[PDB]
């Protein structure tokens, strides 16, 4: 079922980094990773939690649709793109914590907890202190892709639209980045999938990310693994 | 409201070409074109008809969802990518005429006509073969009418389900990066003169949407890439895309 291909470690050491990439070939129901241990370690979800939070906000009506505006509160924060109005699409694009904090307040602790349980999300059992492994990310995302989660079809299609990250004639990537900072080890996340004409390859990676300047490596290393496996040109 | 910008013709003449680009700025409700007259001239929809066709097929249940497979019928056709199975996503990507001619037959004349009137689509005339009227029948639509139709799709205001509308917009996905998303559909009218090339859709920005529609004289297939290239040259000139 799962195969460990340590040759991928080269793409982490090339950039003097340590981390994991987990791939899942949907057609063949086979998985691949460079590090079976780290594939199954649970790290803090950080921004990748915006995926279940979006779904829950939509299904409960807290977010009416992807065009609804969420006004900046006029408090300047360190990330300039946050200091403006947003809709669901822009808020995911720029990973706008204060907007998603608001969704969570309105959702409330009790319903948030009931729905993450319906989703079987994270390792924890019952980022709001949610730990989740890369392989657990894939399993959650496979449910999203197939519209199997316990929310409406509409909520799931809207979130998949908001995860749109890249598209050309060769592939479509839906995905979400994350950077976990408040507890060592500081790590970057990138989770999602790449759509091809007649297959889907799910992915989930995280990597030690001590500073901040390395954050591009999250996509870059993931793509080197995809190119090595001829999943993308 | 409407403004003519003739400077855009340089992009056509530099390719020895004639055509029109129309742009609609959604926030400001203003339009821009190099040729008001040709913007309002109605042509055969050709493969741009796959948008309304997809919507109707989905709403009527002819297409269950974007994963349903339409097996190739064994008949080897000229375009190699047509000679294989498809779903709605791939069928739109490769503009797979025979899949859509099957849709049209299942839809039938009456429901196709009724729907196009509900859509207020072009001249709403399906006269001819039900599975080719958009290629060599009576249907006619202008660039400004494509935009008007696309804007109704963009706001989920067509008289079909929201779901139908969301699935079709997924299948129109063409390009996406950190700067913009293009949802569009190409066309090439080839059977009835004047031969023209189409490209219609929109550019999603963070805080605005620019709808577009261009057609251009297309004597030969050698120039088909110009549809996108001229449109992007206009978009770059107007600082819509880098
Ligand atoms: C998510 O983990 N966060 C929100 C924001 N950007 O996340 S992303 O670029 O990795 O997608 C900043 C970092 C981080 C946070 N401050 O909690
Ligand atoms: C649509 O106008 N057509 C279908 C097919 N797609 O070419 S496209 O790249 O312009 O969409 C070939 C051209 C044309 C046709 N001959 O039916
Ligand atoms: Cl929104
Ligand atoms: Cl999409
Ligand atoms: Cl429907």
Author numbering:
A (entry chain A): 24 to 149, 159 to 265
B (entry chain B): 24 to 265
Give verbatim lines from the article.
Here, we report the occurrence of single (OXA-48:P68A) and double (OXA-48:P68A,Y211S) amino acid substitutions within OXA-48 as a response to CAZ and CAZ-AVI exposure, respectively. The antimicrobial susceptibility data and enzyme kinetics showed that the P68A substitution was responsible for an increased activity toward CAZ, whereas P68A,Y211S led to a decrease in the inhibitory activity of AVI. X-ray crystallography structures revealed that OXA-48:P68A leads to increased flexibility within the OXA-48 structure, likely contributing to elevated CAZ hydrolysis.
Two new crystal structures of OXA-48:P68A were obtained after soaking. The second OXA-48:P68A structure was in complex with AVI (OXA-48:P68A-AVI) and resolved to 2.22 Å. R214 and the Ω-loop were in the same conformation as in the native OXA-48. For OXA-48:P68A, we observed no change in the inhibitory activity of AVI. In addition, Y211 in OXA-48 stabilizes AVI binding by aromatic stacking.
